[PDB]
């Protein structure tokens, strides 16, 4: 038993809700919140900008130190950093950004990072400003992640389409 509430169960291990991940993160304090990161951990907009704003820019400060030490992530890769006031940990995961021409096949590699964590609150990778089809992202999530994932979808309209078209 865990504290996630109001989710629709899609599969054995994947759940979904119309929610603002920032507000869901502040209420659940999950062990892991996933950020829709880029390779530079520049949290300017989308989910990343919202999560970072909710940390009063502490996420960005920590991220800049991480990059200065380690260099950029790989597309499809991840790193674990602090969850600040939102979660114990933040798993920064880089999905491919279609608006940069990145290979959508890397989306599966991106979701594989979730399997290193037993339970996660997450957005749909490569959705929103990353330009991928959220219905495809949900399919890859379901077919790749084996650990327990609670997907927060900000847009109510989108959420209804994802549920209604789910196979
Ligand atoms: O923007 C993207 O990268 C993806 C995923 N994204 C989200 N998904 C779940 N919760 C979200 N809270 C937000 C607050 C914001 F200010 C901006 C985006 C979100 C958001 C929105 C749709 O497309």
DSSP secondary structure string for all residues of 63-78: HHHHHHHH-PPPTT-E
Tokens 């520049």 locate to: 42
Range of the domain at 55: 8-165
Q: How far apart are CA 87 and CA 62, in angstroms?
A: 15
Residue 1 maps to a domain: no
Residue nearest to atom 2 of ligand 1 (CA): 128
HSE-CB at 86 with a 13 A cutoff on CA atoms is: 30
DSSP output for 39-104 = TT----SHHHHHHHHHTTTHHHHHHHHHHHHH-PPPTT-EEEEE-TTT-SEEEEE----GGGT--T
Residue 120 maps to a domain: yes
Residue nearest to atom 3 of ligand 1 (CA): 128
Residue 48 CB less than 6 A away from ligand 1:
no
Q: 3-state DSSP call for residue 132?
A: coil
Residue 141 CB less than 6 A away from ligand 1:
no
Structural domain total, the chain: 1
Residue 47 CB less than 6 A away from ligand 1:
yes
Q: What is the CATH number of the domain that holds 47?
A: 3.40.220.10
Residue 39 maps to a domain: yes
Q: How was this structure determined?
A: X-ray
Could you tell me which of 41, 72, 68, 70 has the C-alpha nearest to residue 57?
41
Contacts of 126 (CB under 8 A, 6+ apart): 36, 95, 96, 97, 98, 104, 107, 110, 132, 137
Could you tell me which of 144, 91, 79, 86 has the C-alpha nearest to residue 122?
91
Give resolution in angstroms: 1.0
Residue 56 maps to a domain: yes
């Amino acid at each position: 038993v865990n504290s996630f509430s109001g989710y629709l169960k899609l599969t054995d291990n994947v759940y979904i809700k119309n929610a603002d991940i920032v507000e869901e993160a502040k209420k659940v304090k999950p062990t892991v919140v996933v950020n829709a990161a880029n390779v530079y951990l520049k949290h300017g907009g989308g989910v990343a900008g919202a999560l970072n704003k909710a940390t009063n820019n502490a996420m960005q400060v920590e991220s800049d130190d991480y990059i200065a030490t380690n260099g950029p992530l790989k597309v499809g890769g991840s790193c674990v950093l602090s969850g600040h006031n939102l979660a114990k940990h933040c798993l920064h995961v880089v999905g491919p950004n279609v608006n940069k021409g990145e290979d959508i096949q890397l989306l599966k590699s991106a979701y594989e990072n979730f399997n290193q964590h037993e339970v996660l609150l997450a957005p749909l990778l490569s959705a929103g400003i990353f330009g991928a089809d959220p219905i495809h992202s949900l399919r890859v999530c379901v077919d790749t992640v084996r650990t327990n994932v609670y997907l927060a979808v900000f847009d109510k309209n989108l959420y209804d389409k994802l549920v209604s078209s789910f196979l």
